[PDB]
């Protein structure tokens, strides 16, 4: 959170009090046909578009938007690292107790176990690189759902709009029943372009951004564990891995 | 399995969108000029494609509905890690475990070149070139549905412009226009619908099942390079359990 | 043939989808509202390309109909395997293998030089450069037709808005609105017909025939470098059978 729901309520109130200042007051906004067309069509087009192994991740993704990524931001890895090399120097790499403190991290623990069982300096590198590559493949597969939902939503806006144009032209065309119908039967492209471009394309974007943040976190985990494997100098680990966080937090290394 | 539910849901969404707004849906079913979308779309894809339009299209249009009951990754780990043990029992000759192997020749050539084939790098070369050629063939498959989705709404609104130049070439006092210009917009509805909710997601699902097939066959290459080297079941699961989600990685604890 | 049976279907689709709803055909006959489109896309494509308009526009407009009577992949196996068996008999001195090879010149510069030239890391690279140059030359004409497909509907939009300007300004003399609004209608009809049923699928046809030629010439590459060693000519029949589809792959059993 801290950016998702604030922006979502900001976009909904932007639409609402940008519409009630101008015009209609949600009266011709909940006529349950164009809403039904865009929402049932968007969910139908994404379940056609995606297999059943990937459409069984819509609530998992749709809440991992909002569940914040509180797992080891890079600046607290420096006290978490930079002492294992002292553990790999005072008693060596034979610290069998080293993999028990890995209380919240995905593949630190098995990575440290396959680090301490044997010297595997290139083996850990390509194992963890294939790990983060498969994870980014899975998150590209994740963000593709919201990407293609954002593609198919405004097309369904045009679809509901031309359904309504058929309904409005072939109707009482004297003075107002053309106009009231063609007013009411145009909210399809409003609610279709709003859901496509202001909801599901920034949601796909935010899945991409969080995937890139997590991949940078996995890469600095890779460089940290392949620094603390062979027992580097603990004073130059900060020289190695502080580059991923900006100078605004590199100059906060003055405590 | 999931494309069936979607086609039924898309058609009922369309039909309730008809009957709520006021479309009769019987006149939309019979304007009789729906060849501009159907025969027009198949004409545009026959101009667009060589002789792979009756000789290739229904053959994978029934792969669009065929369930992938071909060796899912969740059960694929105990298919290996016994073969890798069995290579480390008498040598790299025992092909007697490669007898059931009902998926593909991709396991046949891989395992039968791992045994009695004296090749290590020649394995991954031909396996990766085979999966790249299969990927290119499925690109050639999905391109048909992609292109039909691109040309369908344009030919539908081409039906609309023919309908409106037919309608405005009339006496046109009050009621013939209106009705005929609505019958003109029946064509652009079919172009939008059949082509946005069908052919772009059919192309998309061919792309996604292509990604699934490439994933399920790139994960088999470590299964062939494993039994070629004669590995151990402490290494296989630390090498290829990454190609299945975290929700199913902890379920491999029994 | 597949180019022809689609073009006649698209033109007859336009024609009968008009004549079952339209009344005259004199709307788009001669307004010279097509002069924005027909001269417009040809003006844009002759600005867009450096003297490939009298050189290569009708030349590969002709190859869009040439049914390729080149040796498809399923008869390369009784072509290359017995030639590799000949190379296993006597060596690379088979000068009697290319004198009957009255075919495309892609074959002679790999076959005839096999008696007086190294070919493993040499002819593979030369054939790869030659097929990349072929891909660039067909990319030129494919690019010509993609660009015609991108400037054509925008010129239809342009002729439409010329008709709009002439519509609501040149006004209030109502029996003058024919060649403004019907001009715009025929303008957008030409834009979305000539270009979407024509120049995008012509571009796609050039791209697909070029990729058929790419796959055909690359399996010719693997064949001609298989001739250089004659690597047990039935072993040759697995490294190239993946290019022909899985339909005609189980047919290959004799």
């Amino acid at each position: 959170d801290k950016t998702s729901l604030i922006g979502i309520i900001l976009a909904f109130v932007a639409l609402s009090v940008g519409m009630v200042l101008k015009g209609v007051s949600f009266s011709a906004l909940a006529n349950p046909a164009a809403i039904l067309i865009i929402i049932a069509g968007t969910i139908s087009a994404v379940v056609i578009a995606f297999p059943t192994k990937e459409i069984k991740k819509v609530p998992t993704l749709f809440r991992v938007l909002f569940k914040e990524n509180k797992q080891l931001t890079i600046e607290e890895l420096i006290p978490m690292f930079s002492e294992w090399a002292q553990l790999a120097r005072r008693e060596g790499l034979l610290a069998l107790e080293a993999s028990i403190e890995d209380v919240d991290d995905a593949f630190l623990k098995n990575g440290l176990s396959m680090a301490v069982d044997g010297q595997s300096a290139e083996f850990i590198r390509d194992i963890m690189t294939e790990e983060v590559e498969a994870m980014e493949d899975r998150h590209q597969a994740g963000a593709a759902i919201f990407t293609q939902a954002g593609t198919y939503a405004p097309t369904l806006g045009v679809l509901g709009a031309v359904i309504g144009l058929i309904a409005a032209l072939s109707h009482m065309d004297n003075t107002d029943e053309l106009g009231h119908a063609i007013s009411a039967a145009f909210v399809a492209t409003l609610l279709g372009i709003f859901t496509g471009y202001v909801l599901w394309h920034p949601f796909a974007n935010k899945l991409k951004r969080k995937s890139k943040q997590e991949v940078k976190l996995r890469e600095v985990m890779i460089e940290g564990v392949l620094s603390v494997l062979e027992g580097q100098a603990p004073k130059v680990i900060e020289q190695k891995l502080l580059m991923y966080l900006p100078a605004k937090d590199r100059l906060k290394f003055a405590e | 399995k999931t494309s069936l539910i979607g086609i039924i849901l898309a058609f009922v969404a369309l039909s309730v969108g008809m009957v709520l707004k006021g479309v009769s849906f019987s006149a939309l079913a019979n304007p009789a000029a729906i060849l501009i979308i159907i025969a027009g779309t198949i004409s545009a894809v026959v101009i667009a494609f060589p002789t792979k339009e009756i000789k290739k299209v229904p053959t994978l249009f029934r792969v669009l509905f065929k369930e992938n009951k071909q060796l899912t990754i969740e059960e694929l780990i105990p298919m290996f890690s016994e073969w890798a043990q069995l290579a480390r029992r008498e040598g790299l000759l025992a092909l007697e475990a490669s007898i059931e192997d009902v998926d593909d020749a991709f396991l046949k050539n891989g395992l039968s070149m791992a045994v009695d084939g004296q090749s290590a790098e020649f394995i991954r070369d031909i396996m990766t070139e085979e999966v790249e050629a299969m990927e290119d063939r499925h690109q050639a498959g999905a391109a048909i549905f992609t292109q039909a989705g691109t040309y369908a709404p344009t030919l539908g609104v081409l039906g609309a412009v023919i309908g409106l130049i037919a309608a405005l070439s009339h006496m046109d006092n009050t009621d013939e226009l209106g009705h005929a210009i609505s019958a003109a917009f029946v064509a652009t509805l079919l172009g939008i619908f059949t082509g946005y909710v069908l052919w772009h997601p059919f192309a998309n699902k061919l792309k996604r099942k292509s990604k699934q097939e490439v994933k399920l066959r790139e994960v088999m290459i470590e299964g062939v390079l494993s039994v070629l080297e004669g590995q151990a079941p402490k290494v296989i699961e630390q090498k290829l359990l990454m190609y299945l989600p975290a929700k199913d990685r902890l379920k491999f604890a029994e | 043939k597949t180019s022809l049976i689609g073009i006649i279907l698209a033109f007859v689709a336009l024609s009968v989808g008009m004549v079952l709803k339209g009344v005259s055909f004199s709307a788009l006959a001669n307004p010279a509202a097509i002069l924005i489109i027909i001269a417009g896309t040809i003006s844009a494509v002759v600005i867009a390309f450096p003297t490939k308009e009298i050189k290569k526009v009708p030349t590969l407009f002709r190859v869009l109909f040439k049914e390729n009577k080149q040796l498809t992949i399923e008869e390369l196996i009784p072509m290359f395997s017995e030639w590799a068996q000949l190379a296993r008999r006597e060596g690379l001195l088979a000068l009697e293998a290319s004198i009957e090879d009255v075919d495309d010149a892609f074959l002679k510069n790999g076959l005839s030089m096999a008696v007086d030239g190294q070919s493993a890391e040499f002819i593979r690279d030369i054939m790869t450069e030659e097929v990349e140059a072929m891909e660039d030359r067909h990319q030129a004409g494919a690019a010509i037709f993609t660009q015609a497909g991108t400037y054509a509907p925008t010129l239809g939009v342009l002729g439409a808005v010329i008709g709009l300007i002439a519509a609501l300004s040149h006004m209030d003399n109502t029996d003058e609105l024919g060649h403004a609004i019907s001009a715009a209608f025929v303008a957008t009809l030409l834009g979305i017909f000539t270009g979407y049923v024509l120049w995008h699928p012509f571009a796609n046809k050039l791209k697909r025939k070029s990729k058929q030629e790419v796959k055909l010439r690359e399996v010719m590459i693997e064949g001609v470098l298989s001739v250089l060693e004659g690597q047990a000519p039935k072993v040759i029949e697995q490294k190239l059978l993946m290019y022909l589809p899985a339909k005609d792959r189980l047919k290959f059993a004799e």
């Binding site: 045009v158 144009l165 | 409106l164 946005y196 | 939009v157 519509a167 609105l177 209608f185 957008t188 979305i192």
Partner: peptide
């Protein structure tokens, strides 16, 4: 990105010229 604006601009041109030719009084 998307490319659906091509039919959508067309139905807008068409219904535009429709209400142009109906605008006659």
């Amino acid at each position: 990105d998307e490319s659906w604006l091509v039919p959508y601009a067309d139905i807008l041109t068409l219904l535009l010229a429709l209400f142009i030719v109906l605008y006659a009084s």
